Amino acid sequence: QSEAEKARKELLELEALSMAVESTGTAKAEAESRAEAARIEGEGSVLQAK
Amino acid sequence: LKAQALAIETEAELQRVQKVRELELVYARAQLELEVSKAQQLAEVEVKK
């Protein structure tokens, strides 16, 4: 069981890296989509105001 | 972007308000002249009577 835990430590490190990658990817994708939509809406608002 | 749009619309509204208010001021001055003319004429006729 000690040897199994020795391997499980590295396995958990890899799992943590994968989880961080997935979470940051999802968050950045949603944030960038919303930001692009807001920028387009703002430019349209400027033109409509003119 | 909101600041840009606000500046554009503010300048347009200010131009319109300035024109409207100057026209209203001219009309009010004319109305005041007419009112004072009528008042002084009626005062003159009643004083003479």
Swiss-Prot record, chain A:
Superkingdom classification of source: Eukaryota
Modification after translation (UniProt): Phosphorylated on Tyr residues after EGF stimulation. Dephosphorylated by PTPN11.
Induction note: Up-regulated by IFNG/IFN-gamma.
Location of cross-link Glycyl lysine isopeptide (Lys-Gly) (interchain with G-Cter in SUMO2): K9
Tissue: Present in most normal tissues. Higher expression observed in epithelial cells with secretory and excretory functions, as well as in cells chronically exposed to xenobiotics, such as bronchial cells and cells lining the intestine. Overexpressed in many multidrug-resistant cancer cells.
Subcellular location: Cytoplasm; Nucleus, Nuclear pore complex; Cytoplasm, Perinuclear region
Assembly with partners or alone: The vault ribonucleoprotein particle is a huge (400 A x 670 A) cage structure of 12.9 MDa. It consists of a dimer of half-vaults, with each half-vault comprising 39 identical major vault protein (MVP) chains, PARP4 and one or more vault RNAs (vRNAs). Interacts with TEP1. Interacts with PTEN and activated MAPK1. The phosphorylated protein interacts with the SH2 domains of PTPN11 and SRC. Interacts with APEX1. May interact with ZNF540.
Entry note about domains: MVP 3 mediates interaction with PTEN.
Role played: Required for normal vault structure. Vaults are multi-subunit structures that may act as scaffolds for proteins involved in signal transduction. Vaults may also play a role in nucleo-cytoplasmic transport. Down-regulates IFNG-mediated STAT1 signaling and subsequent activation of JAK. Down-regulates SRC activity and signaling through MAP kinases.
Protein name, entry field: Major vault protein
Source organism of the structure: Homo sapiens
Range covered out of full length: 696 to 745 of 893
From Swiss-Prot, chain B:
Induction, as annotated: Up-regulated by IFNG/IFN-gamma.
Quaternary context: The vault ribonucleoprotein particle is a huge (400 A x 670 A) cage structure of 12.9 MDa. It consists of a dimer of half-vaults, with each half-vault comprising 39 identical major vault protein (MVP) chains, PARP4 and one or more vault RNAs (vRNAs). Interacts with TEP1. Interacts with PTEN and activated MAPK1. The phosphorylated protein interacts with the SH2 domains of PTPN11 and SRC. Interacts with APEX1. May interact with ZNF540.
Protein name: Major vault protein
Tissue-wise expression: Present in most normal tissues. Higher expression observed in epithelial cells with secretory and excretory functions, as well as in cells chronically exposed to xenobiotics, such as bronchial cells and cells lining the intestine. Overexpressed in many multidrug-resistant cancer cells.
Localization in the cell: Cytoplasm; Nucleus, Nuclear pore complex; Cytoplasm, Perinuclear region
Organism from which the protein derives: Homo sapiens
PTM remark: Phosphorylated on Tyr residues after EGF stimulation.
Function statement: Required for normal vault structure. Vaults are multi-subunit structures that may act as scaffolds for proteins involved in signal transduction. Vaults may also play a role in nucleo-cytoplasmic transport. Down-regulates IFNG-mediated STAT1 signaling and subsequent activation of JAK. Down-regulates SRC activity and signaling through MAP kinases.
Comment, domains: MVP 3 mediates interaction with PTEN. MVP 4 mediates interaction with PARP4.
Taxon lineage: Eukaryota, Metazoa, Chordata, Craniata, Vertebrata
Span within the parent record: 746 to 794 of 893
